[PDB]
A paper describes a structure:
In Gram-negative bacteria, N-terminal lipidation is a signal for protein trafficking from the inner membrane (IM) to the outer membrane (OM). The IM complex LolCDE extracts lipoproteins from the membrane and moves them to the chaperone [name]. The [name]-lipoprotein complex crosses the periplasm after which the lipoprotein is anchored to the OM. In γ-proteobacteria anchoring is assisted by the receptor [name], while a corresponding protein has not been identified in other phyla.
Author numbering:
A (entry chain B): 17 to 198
B (entry chain A): -2 to 0, 17 to 198
The structure:
Amino acid sequence: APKDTLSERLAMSEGFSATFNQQVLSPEGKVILTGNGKVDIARPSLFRWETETPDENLLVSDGTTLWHFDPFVEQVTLYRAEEALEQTPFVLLTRNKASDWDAYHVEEKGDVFTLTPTALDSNQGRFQITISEKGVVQGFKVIEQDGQQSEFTFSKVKQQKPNASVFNYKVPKGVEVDDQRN
Amino acid sequence: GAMAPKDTLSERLAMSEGFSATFNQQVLSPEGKVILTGNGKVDIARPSLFRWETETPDENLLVSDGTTLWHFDPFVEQVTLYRAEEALEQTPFVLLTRNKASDWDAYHVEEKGDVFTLTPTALDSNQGRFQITISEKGVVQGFKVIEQDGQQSEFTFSKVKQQKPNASVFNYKVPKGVEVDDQRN
Ligand SMILES: [Zn+2]
Ligand SMILES: [Zn+2]
Ligand SMILES: [Zn+2]
Ligand SMILES: [Zn+2]
Ligand SMILES: [Zn+2]
Ligand SMILES: [Zn+2]
Ligand SMILES: [Zn+2]
């Protein structure tokens, strides 16, 4: 099955580190933004998404707190890691079992897996994960209902679980802290 | 598969007499960041026929009917004419129109899965390496032009129609008011 193929491929490694490039395309197909950064991901639930361009910022979850640090505005915002998917979709790359995909219909074409929300009332868009038969994640795409798509491609993949330390974010000096856990 | 790279690459290209598709381009610097994007559409009929219509970065048209290669630029409103048998001199895209082993005579070819890497056997070539990604069913997914210093111009195909375009698609007619730069020599 497609869900089982996706999950078994994600399960081949407990984590990875990589650089990424990003391209955002309008519904018309026009490039709106290009960006880049780095990622560390350990399964389940742990992700450290570091954006270099165009908006330098850090998003990091230890499975309990989701932190958002933006250096330009000297701000740290706190969220429940329970509500990660509401805030960011990158947490999908940290899944590793078929029951994690209950909200979606899954389809496979080669290494490309498309996850479509089951309900039709959805405002959420579809997702795509490109992952090799050896379990190497090649890309991730977020497609809005109106056709706008943000595309992430991974390179320089280190197919090893990052240390737990990488996700234990400490609030730094010189920032305001906005608690959004309640 | 990988023990006969040119035969496999040839057999896969021969699976369809042509295709049409949209394409998107990314150029990556030697340090791996995106420095340029583009898009357009392509029609290919095998052998030798191609129509590569670019929208970005520069809007322009390249089309060969096997005899004449036309390059039309709408900003300068000029079309240059070339001999089609020298198409490779002007564009690497003609490589997607091949379908037999003797067409890869100038290259060492490596197959790793669906990715075929074409390397000029001698280092002198101003051109660097080429990469064609094509399924076992013959569907071209992408094409890369790689420079020696690491820069890569990467093309990805989408909305593919695995069907031969009509021969009429490649019978370019020079539009009224366009200047003609004849290089057929
Ligand atoms: Zn994170
Ligand atoms: Zn709240
Ligand atoms: Zn053969
Ligand atoms: Zn055009
Ligand atoms: Zn132009
Ligand atoms: Zn060899
Ligand atoms: Zn005109």
